[PDB]
RNA sequence: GAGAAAGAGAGUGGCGCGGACGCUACGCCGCGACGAGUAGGAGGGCCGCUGCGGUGAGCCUUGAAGCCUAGGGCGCGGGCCC
RNA sequence: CCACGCGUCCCCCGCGAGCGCACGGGGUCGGCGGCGAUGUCGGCUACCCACCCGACCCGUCUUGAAACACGGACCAAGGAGU
């Protein structure tokens, strides 16, 4: 016959097309709500500093929950305790980068590899542009470039991370499923820095590049990708 | 107005020089055919700078233009006229060579049969 | 609406509504 | 697939993020509007300096 | 059957020739003349072959019947097509398609007949 | 049926309309515009009638063919390209042709043509170069302008007019087009003092003069 | 009836101290001696023009002896207005300290 | 190829005769990451030599083996074909 | 403003049609110009020569060899895990 068998094919096709359209409206409004949340997160740490200075007290802001490590010293001649920490940070090649949340279990790992990494507190623009330009994904333990939202949504759908700004929100606003969202991300293959390093061997305090350079990691990121 | 092939891509070759075997210039007893030297102090084996280069795998041509003659075809060594019917349909890709041993009387039958079957022969005038 | 199990009648209803 | 760059290529950025379109529409309208406001205040300042 | 005798013939046949990184097969009922499984003509129950005629012009088409498999003299039937190039190809197309006779070789036989007839029309 | 209106939003930047989809819904007025729901030719012959099949099958097959190509999108043919001008080249400027047989001769520019080329004459009465086409990359444009807003160049001269044919003897139509255009152009350049002597001379780099330091 | 190419000297190849890379010529263009002045010459056509024994064919004319190697300027090179170029066949070291004519015609004015 | 475990499932009641390539499955194709190496281990050689059983209705006095070559070439290479 | 209809109960205050443009799953032109029969075109390679950069002679035992460590004038054939 192929009369109703024909039409139910395009019934099912139209059904999944409308399903895809409802999903796109979903992630549109999720991105809008995120933009509102980031406006509030930026303005409230100005608001509360102002209300502290208005009384004459001081407002200590919260210690940040998210750093971005970069491996600035190469393979050769690495002490093994410094080596295993880098393997758990997934900084294997030179000039790889990884988002890392902070706590006492992680800062004492980062100080073991302080001569070899440069790390600081990455800005919202940094967490955006790293994902969009250099952000890939460990899909089926392969390395597939994040070209469409389905590559994110098939791997991270059960953590309710189904577009790319969901991934950006989970990385930046460090969420509940940060471990899974970050271990989804392949380590960032950042290029050698344009302009050039100050000094590879010594710490940032003593005029170098190794170690914690807190707000200044963004200047490094902008010229490394 | 010869038998032009199907497609003729740009046959890019990575290296055009031969691999001279190390110190084949220095002696006559040493042919230029490459032998990877297995010495313990050798400048070539441990890849010094400005030395005789070694034939790694990365020098291999791409599989789409491997074994390909500069006219775009691939050769096929043909002994008798009975084997040109094998290239009757592999025509726009694979061309025919007549072997060195074949008589001047038997080259003419092969060349005329190839002219019928539209097969390029690399050496069509090998005896005249 | 957007997830396919429970939002099926809602997507069908908005499909009827977009005419 | 060839990875095109969402920070340069517009419709790949929209493909990953359709709200980037209305952010960029609103911010281009705001760029032009604040620009015209500053040009109008500069013309008013020049008129007040003449007067 | 067929898949055992293919795994016997595949590397050990006298029709196979192997040189210049190219593998061929010279059995008489082979279309495209190459060593594969679809095109080998000695193996299958049903088999199309295209040959030039005993006369200088014309195309003979060889059909393997279904009954005398072990009987080689009464297995292959010949048919000679000494016609124009369009109707020769439409005849071969109708024989392979509409008889349901081994339809994967339907285009390879038309390619081969088109290559025979080009050689039979005179040289430039 | 229906008269096709132009685009409702103005284009703000390339690929962005100035009105989002809610305002575009309100403007296009879809709130009230809701909708809901060969090969054989018979011919007589002089038997009966024959059903001829137009576009019949091929009489030959090459022994192997290439496959079809994948689809790409933003790759127009050359006629469908958008065509750029420089900022310095406006109709009325004077040009220095750098490459072809008219080496370095200063020339009045007339019209951006439809293939992308520049319509050219420094009038041949003074620097001996006809109505010619040039290319905007190969041409230095100095900042010396005449006003040719009040001239008419003929509509019938175009890229297909100046296109080469296949000894080249010139037509009489070339002569009458040249004489029609320069009779309007040449009294404009005679108005500016020492400009007709400027156009006769050739640009030449002498010693101690450098194009990165010299302005024009 | 005059000259229409800037003067440039082929200073050397693009080279490290113990390595030279012959796929990139260093051109010293006469008159420009700083990077704020080398802005004009980027992307220009350029040519190494040399005579030889056997006749070549000359486009637009009878066979001459003068042959060329064309190329283009690619990017600046160091603070003194030295510039990089690439020719479509690499320059012979014959040309070290000779006159490459750097053209004007891929013009950006 | 589709973010969501599963049926493009069956049943009962209210003219024009057309459609490329493929698949030596030990074959063909698609993604990802990777490539240092002596002593040593292993794999693949449509690398090479000599003889033997099969086979190419193989080649050859209309000139085989060998040898020479500023000739045309292929292969990363061993080597090989004109 | 990614908000659009009507009808039904109650809390609170599943198939619309067409065309078209494209920052959209990797380049195309539905764009061109010149020179070619005894003086010219192509041939990356293989012959000679020129220049810049690089560049110590192999095997070997050795912690370490270009070594003022030993073997080696040159060539052909035989020549060592059976
Ligand atoms: Mg070290
Ligand atoms: Mg720089
Ligand atoms: Mg030694
Ligand atoms: Mg050693
Ligand atoms: Mg190795
Ligand atoms: Mg040196
Ligand atoms: Mg010893
Ligand atoms: Mg000892
Ligand atoms: Mg010792
Ligand atoms: Mg040792
Ligand atoms: Mg000593
Ligand atoms: Mg001694
Ligand atoms: Mg001793
Ligand atoms: Mg001695």
GROMACS .gro file of C-alpha atoms in nm, chain B residues 12-128:
model
  117
  237UNK     CA    1   5.413   1.526  -0.500
  238UNK     CA    2   5.735   1.349  -0.402
  239UNK     CA    3   5.901   1.410  -0.069
  240UNK     CA    4   6.256   1.325  -0.174
  241UNK     CA    5   6.395   1.303  -0.526
  242UNK     CA    6   6.754   1.211  -0.449
  243UNK     CA    7   6.863   0.853  -0.399
  244UNK     CA    8   6.985   0.727  -0.064
  245UNK     CA    9   7.359   0.698  -0.105
  246UNK     CA   10   7.500   0.440   0.134
  247UNK     CA   11   7.750   0.601   0.370
  248UNK     CA   12   8.105   0.620   0.229
  249UNK     CA   13   8.014   0.489  -0.113
  250UNK     CA   14   8.203   0.787  -0.255
  251UNK     CA   15   8.515   0.705  -0.055
  252UNK     CA   16   8.571   0.356  -0.197
  253UNK     CA   17   8.492   0.165  -0.513
  254UNK     CA   18   8.431  -0.162  -0.326
  255UNK     CA   19   8.123  -0.003  -0.167
  256UNK     CA   20   7.821   0.023  -0.394
  257UNK     CA   21   7.576   0.309  -0.356
  258UNK     CA   22   7.296   0.073  -0.249
  259UNK     CA   23   7.176   0.171   0.098
  260UNK     CA   24   7.281  -0.031   0.402
  261UNK     CA   25   7.193   0.106   0.744
  262UNK     CA   26   7.528   0.122   0.922
  263UNK     CA   27   7.553  -0.046   1.258
  264UNK     CA   28   7.863   0.114   1.400
  265UNK     CA   29   7.910   0.241   1.751
  266UNK     CA   30   8.082   0.572   1.668
  267UNK     CA   31   7.912   0.640   1.337
  268UNK     CA   32   7.816   0.997   1.248
  269UNK     CA   33   7.536   0.876   1.024
  270UNK     CA   34   7.370   0.614   1.246
  271UNK     CA   35   7.318   0.858   1.530
  272UNK     CA   36   7.204   1.135   1.292
  273UNK     CA   37   7.462   1.407   1.316
  274UNK     CA   38   7.410   1.740   1.145
  275UNK     CA   39   7.500   1.781   0.781
  276UNK     CA   40   7.547   1.409   0.726
  277UNK     CA   41   7.412   1.149   0.487
  278UNK     CA   42   7.040   1.121   0.548
  279UNK     CA   43   6.878   0.790   0.645
  280UNK     CA   44   6.569   0.642   0.479
  281UNK     CA   45   6.293   0.663   0.737
  282UNK     CA   46   5.931   0.566   0.677
  283UNK     CA   47   5.818   0.930   0.664
  284UNK     CA   48   5.973   0.966   0.318
  285UNK     CA   49   5.707   0.735   0.175
  286UNK     CA   50   5.481   0.875  -0.093
  287UNK     CA   51   5.106   0.889  -0.054
  288UNK     CA   52   4.903   0.584  -0.144
  289UNK     CA   53   4.705   0.767  -0.412
  290UNK     CA   54   5.019   0.850  -0.610
  291UNK     CA   55   5.247   0.557  -0.527
  292UNK     CA   56   5.424   0.364  -0.807
  293UNK     CA   57   5.272   0.617  -1.046
  294UNK     CA   58   5.450   0.703  -1.368
  295UNK     CA   59   5.484   1.077  -1.446
  296UNK     CA   60   5.229   1.033  -1.724
  297UNK     CA   61   4.978   0.933  -1.455
  298UNK     CA   62   4.966   0.560  -1.527
  299UNK     CA   63   5.101   0.259  -1.344
  300UNK     CA   64   5.322   0.017  -1.533
  301UNK     CA   65   5.246  -0.351  -1.586
  302UNK     CA   66   5.505  -0.587  -1.732
  303UNK     CA   67   5.357  -0.774  -2.029
  304UNK     CA   68   5.534  -1.073  -2.182
  305UNK     CA   69   5.299  -1.197  -2.456
  306UNK     CA   70   5.000  -1.054  -2.641
  307UNK     CA   71   4.768  -1.281  -2.437
  308UNK     CA   72   4.820  -1.061  -2.131
  309UNK     CA   73   4.702  -0.735  -2.287
  310UNK     CA   74   4.348  -0.870  -2.265
  311UNK     CA   75   4.395  -0.850  -1.889
  312UNK     CA   76   4.426  -0.470  -1.909
  313UNK     CA   77   4.119  -0.448  -2.132
  314UNK     CA   78   3.920  -0.277  -1.857
  315UNK     CA   79   4.188  -0.148  -1.618
  316UNK     CA   80   4.251   0.100  -1.896
  317UNK     CA   81   4.247   0.455  -1.763
  318UNK     CA   82   4.473   0.360  -1.471
  319UNK     CA   83   4.724   0.088  -1.558
  320UNK     CA   84   4.952   0.092  -1.862
  321UNK     CA   85   5.163  -0.178  -2.021
  322UNK     CA   86   5.534  -0.243  -2.062
  323UNK     CA   87   5.683  -0.505  -2.291
  324UNK     CA   88   5.964  -0.697  -2.124
  325UNK     CA   89   6.322  -0.678  -2.245
  326UNK     CA   90   6.334  -1.036  -2.367
  327UNK     CA   91   6.049  -1.013  -2.620
  328UNK     CA   92   6.144  -1.042  -2.987
  329UNK     CA   93   6.123  -0.762  -3.238
  330UNK     CA   94   5.877  -0.978  -3.430
  331UNK     CA   95   5.654  -1.021  -3.125
  332UNK     CA   96   5.660  -0.655  -3.024
  333UNK     CA   97   5.455  -0.551  -3.326
  334UNK     CA   98   5.158  -0.776  -3.246
  335UNK     CA   99   5.152  -0.644  -2.889
  336UNK     CA  100   5.174  -0.280  -2.999
  337UNK     CA  101   4.897  -0.318  -3.259
  338UNK     CA  102   4.673  -0.505  -3.013
  339UNK     CA  103   4.734  -0.230  -2.756
  340UNK     CA  104   4.643   0.031  -3.016
  341UNK     CA  105   4.318  -0.157  -3.068
  342UNK     CA  106   4.249  -0.193  -2.696
  343UNK     CA  107   4.340   0.173  -2.621
  344UNK     CA  108   4.613   0.075  -2.375
  345UNK     CA  109   4.909   0.308  -2.335
  346UNK     CA  110   5.239   0.132  -2.398
  347UNK     CA  111   5.540   0.300  -2.236
  348UNK     CA  112   5.788   0.169  -2.495
  349UNK     CA  113   5.595   0.134  -2.822
  350UNK     CA  114   5.896   0.188  -3.050
  351UNK     CA  115   6.153  -0.031  -2.880
  352UNK     CA  116   6.303  -0.197  -3.190
  353UNK     CA  117   6.167  -0.011  -3.499
   0.00000   0.00000   0.00000
